[PDB]
From a paper:
The N-terminal OB domain of the [name] subunit ([name]) is a major protein-protein interaction element for RPA and binds to more than 20 partner proteins. The [name] domain adopts an OB fold with a five-stranded anti-parallel beta-barrel but has very weak ssDNA affinity.
[name] has two tandem RPA-binding motifs with the same sequence localized between its nuclease and helicase domains. We fused one [name] motif to [name], and the fusion construct crystallized in space group P212121 with two molecules in the asymmetry unit. In the structure, [name] 435–451 form a continuous α helix and insert into the amphipathic groove of a symmetry-related RPA70Nb. Residues E439-R31b-D443-R43b-E442-R91b-E445 form a series of electrostatic interactions, and [name] M446 and L449 contact the hydrophobic patch formed by RPA70Nb L87b, V97b, I33b, M57b and I95b. The N-terminal part of each [name] peptide helix interacts with the [name] peptide that it fused to. WRNb Y436b fits into the side-pocket and forms two hydrogen bonds with RPA70Nb R31b. Compared to the [name]–p53 structure, the direction of the WRNa peptide in the groove is reversed and the positions of [name] Y436 and p53 M44 are different. The direction of the other WRNb peptide bound to the side pocket is the same as that of p53b. ITC titration of the [name] peptide with [name] yielded a KD value around 11.6 μM, whereas M466A mutation increased the KD value to around 37.4 μM. Mutation of the conserved arginine residues in [name] (R31, R41, R43, R91) greatly reduced the binding of [name] to the [name] peptide.
Numbering used by the authors:
A (entry chain B): 1 to 123, 435 to 451
B (entry chain A): 1 to 35, 38 to 123, 435 to 449
The structure:
Amino acid sequence: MVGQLSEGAIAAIMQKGDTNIKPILQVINIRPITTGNSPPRYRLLMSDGLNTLSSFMLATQLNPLVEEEQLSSNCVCQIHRFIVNTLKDGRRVVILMELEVLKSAEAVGVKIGNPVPYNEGTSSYVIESDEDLEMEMLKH
Amino acid sequence: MVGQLSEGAIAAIMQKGDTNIKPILQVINIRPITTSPPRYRLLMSDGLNTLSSFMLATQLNPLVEEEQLSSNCVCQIHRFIVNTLKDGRRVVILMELEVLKSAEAVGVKIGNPVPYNEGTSSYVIESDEDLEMEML
C-alpha cells in the first residue's frame, strides 16, 4: 500500500533538506560499490511511493543488514537518522545513519505503486540498473 | 605506458566483432551486479578508450574473490564473445583471461582513456558519483 509510505519525503529532502521527518521508504534496488580492494558500500534506489531517488548511501554500520538480506529489494524501512550532503560536483546525496526495517521484502513481495524518478540522476541510475539486469540474464 | 595496452582493441571488438585478438586491457572498475551467485560488470581500458559493457563469465569469479582481478590490474583476454542484444546494446563476455600484472604492480590507471560511447560516458559519471558518495 502506497499510503503506508512517507509521501513527499523525497521532494522535501531534496528541495528543503528536511532531516527530522523519519521517512518510511521502500528499497527498490541496491547497488554494491566495490572500490579497489575495499569492502563494499551500498547505494540505494529508494521510493516514497511517488518518486524514486538514487542518491542514498548506507552508512558502513548498516552494511550487515544488506549482507544478512534483512535489507533487500522491496523491503520497507523507517529511516531514523540521515544527513543530506552536497558533493563537490553539486550532486545532493543522503547518508542513511540509522534505520529499522518495518517489513521484509517477502512480506511486501514487490514494488509498491509506480514511482517515477525524481531527477535525471535517478533516471540514469535506473538505466544502468536495467543494463545490469539485461547483461545478467544469459539464460532464457 | 598506454602503448603497453592493446590500443584500438575496444574499437575492433565493438565495430568488427573481432574475437580472434588476444587483447591486453586494464581493469578500471569492477562491480557485482546482484546483492545469489555474484556476477561482475567491468569497466575496461585499452589505453585509448574505456568500455563498460564487459561482463565476467561465472567461472572467472574466483579471480575476483581472490582479489587478483581488481581495479588497475592488467589482463590478457584469451577467450571472449561479443553480441548485440535485441535492444541494440553490445555486450562483451570475458570467458578466459590471465592477470598479467596485479593492481599493485601497475599502481595506477594507465593514461587518460575516453569513453568509447555514450553508455560508457554515463557509466563513468555514475561510477565517479558512486565513489564520491563513499568517501564521505
